């Protein structure tokens, strides 16, 4: 079965970007859409949009890359150099507002899920709350 929907999505994204896909579909879920909202706002993805594949709901994720490069291998630098799942089924990970990590010395983010909604580490710290540590992106 599909054991971890959230992890499935981060991977679909990690996988598509590595081959430079423009778009990329992932089965829609309220929660997954909540995450994508941050991904866009934090500028990691051009954005995303609801779509119907074979009749079922999906979320097109519009990938973003750096510009073309010089020398051999003109492949663009990724905008999403990283993106790793943390809390996972059978090893849930929650943090207090004092334990919210500082990803990549601030240049990267961390998406938490708080009783105040899905926020980034900075947002969470502001609202002074903690919660399940969904993932880490940079």
């Amino acid at each position: 079965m599909l054991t971890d929907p959230i992890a499935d999505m981060l991977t679909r994204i990690r996988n598509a970007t590595r081959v430079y896909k423009e778009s990329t579909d992932v089965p829609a879920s309220r929660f997954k859409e909540e995450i994508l909202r941050i991904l866009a706002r934090e500028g990691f993805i051009k954005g995303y949009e609801r779509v119907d594949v074979d009749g079922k709901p999906y979320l097109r994720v519009y990938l973003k890359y750096g510009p073309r490069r010089q020398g051999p291998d003109p492949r663009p630098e990724q905008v999403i150099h990283h993106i790793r799942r943390i809390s996972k089924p059978g090893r849930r990970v929650y943090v207090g507002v004092k334990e919210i990590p500082r990803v990549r010395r601030g240049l990267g983010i961390a998406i938490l899920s708080t009783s105040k909604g899905v926020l980034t580490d900075r947002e969470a710290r502001k609202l002074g709350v903690g919660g399940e540590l969904i993932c880490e992106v940079w």
Binding site: G90, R91, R92, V93
Partner: protein
């Protein structure tokens, strides 16, 4: 506060006493995942009220017997052997894994 607990009556085989199986959860001190252990308490049932399968609230009390420091505060939800089953089925595997072996 006299500690209050909730569990299931997995045994009604004694007089004025019942065996409540209180479940508990928590994060492993080193590996963090939420593990789930469980303990059986012998609770005092004077009226012989509570029956096998009942979910009850146990309350810290004054000793009643040796190995018996809890009284059945109240009933939370009656009948539901789906739980007693787990407990019994688990006791059943014990009936082996020694010199023979537990079914399946």
């Amino acid at each position: 506060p006299k500690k209050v607990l909730t569990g299931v009556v997995v045994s009604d085989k004694m007089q004025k006493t019942v065996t409540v199986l209180v479940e508990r959860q928590f994060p492993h001190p080193l590996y963090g995942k939420v593990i789930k252990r469980s303990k059986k308490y012998l609770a005092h049932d004077p009226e012989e009220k509570y029956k096998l399968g009942d979910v009850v609230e146990i309350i810290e009390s004054r000793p009643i017997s040796k190995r018996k420091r809890f009284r059945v505060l109240r009933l939370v939800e009656s009948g539901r052997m789906d739980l007693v089953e787990k407990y019994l089925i688990r006791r059943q595997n014990y009936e082996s894994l020694s010199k023979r072996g537990g079914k399946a």
